[PDB]
């Protein structure tokens, strides 16, 4: 993957190019108002060490932070989401510790309410591929990167509560 950060909008000002994870971008730029993703899937973060607000980006050009649904020009860390082939897979539970009613997803879910008649998810088991968990339906609201693995409680994916609106498989822009 390859991503380039620009201090000013429309790809202006000082820039920095990354082709791997980076827990601290502060030494390279003081602000980010535009981004060019040459290839790959990326999660960029407001604070160092993958902390703070998270935003998902794929191949494309983002002339302003609003284009990646960002809140500001503060970006201090980024991670390259490993490319994934084949089927995606994750199980959702209505209780913590992977207990309670369970359902399995192998494709995107634009509305957890419409699909499972659930407004909250208490534990997860991401078996295949990375996903993005959205607070609101239709990929809106706060974002939380879900890497493969077990999430015993909502705190594990970094959310303040168990509300979930939509779930998206992380895959690069089709070409």
Note down the domain range covering 23.
1-83
CA-based angle 29:131:54, to the nearest 5? Answer: 30
Looking at the fold, whether 57 and 95 belong to one and the same domain comes out as no
**Cα 52 to Cα 50: distance, rounded to the nearest angstrom:** 7
Number of domains in the chain: 2
Closest CA to 76 of 137, 158, 21: 21
Experimental method: X-ray
Assign residue 107 the CATH number of its domain: 2.60.20.10
CA dihedral 41, 71, 5, 173 (to 10 degrees): 30
**Cα 109 to Cα 113: distance, rounded to the nearest angstrom:** 9
- CA 117 from chain centre, in angstroms, equals 23
Q: Establish how many alpha carbons lie within 13 A of residue 23's alpha carbon, considering only the half-sphere containing its beta carbon.
A: 1
Residue whose pair of structure tokens reads 């899937």 in the numeric block: 41
Looking at the fold, whether 134 and 72 belong to one and the same domain comes out as no
DSSP H/E element including 113: helix 112-116
Looking at the fold, whether 36 and 99 belong to one and the same domain comes out as no
**Cα 94 to Cα 118: distance, rounded to the nearest angstrom:** 8
Query: Resolution reached, in Å?
Result: 1.7
């Amino acid at each position: 993957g390859k991503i380039t950060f620009y201090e000013d909008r429309a790809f202006q000002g000082r820039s920095y190019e990354c082709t791997t994870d980076c827990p601290n971008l502060q030494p390279y730029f003081s602000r980010c108002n535009s981004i060019r993703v040459e290839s790959g899937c990326w999660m960029i973060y407001e604070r160092p060490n993958y902390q703070g607000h998270q935003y998902f980006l794929r191949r494309g050009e983002y002339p302003d932070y609003q284009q990646w649904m960002g809140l500001s020009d503060s970006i201090r860390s980024c991670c390259l989401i490993p490319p994934h082939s084949g089927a995606y897979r994750m199980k959702i539970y209505d209780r913590d510790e992977l207990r309670g009613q369970m359902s399995e997803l192998t494709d995107d879910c634009l509305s957890v309410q419409d699909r499972f008649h659930l407004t909250e998810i208490h534990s997860l088991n991401v078996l295949e591929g990375s996903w993005i968990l959205y607070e609101m339906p239709n990929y809106r609201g706060r974002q939380y990167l879900l890497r493969p693995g077990e999430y015993r409680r909502f705190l594990d994916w970094g959310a303040p509560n168990a509300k979930v609106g939509s779930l998206r498989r992380v895959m690069d822009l089709y070409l």
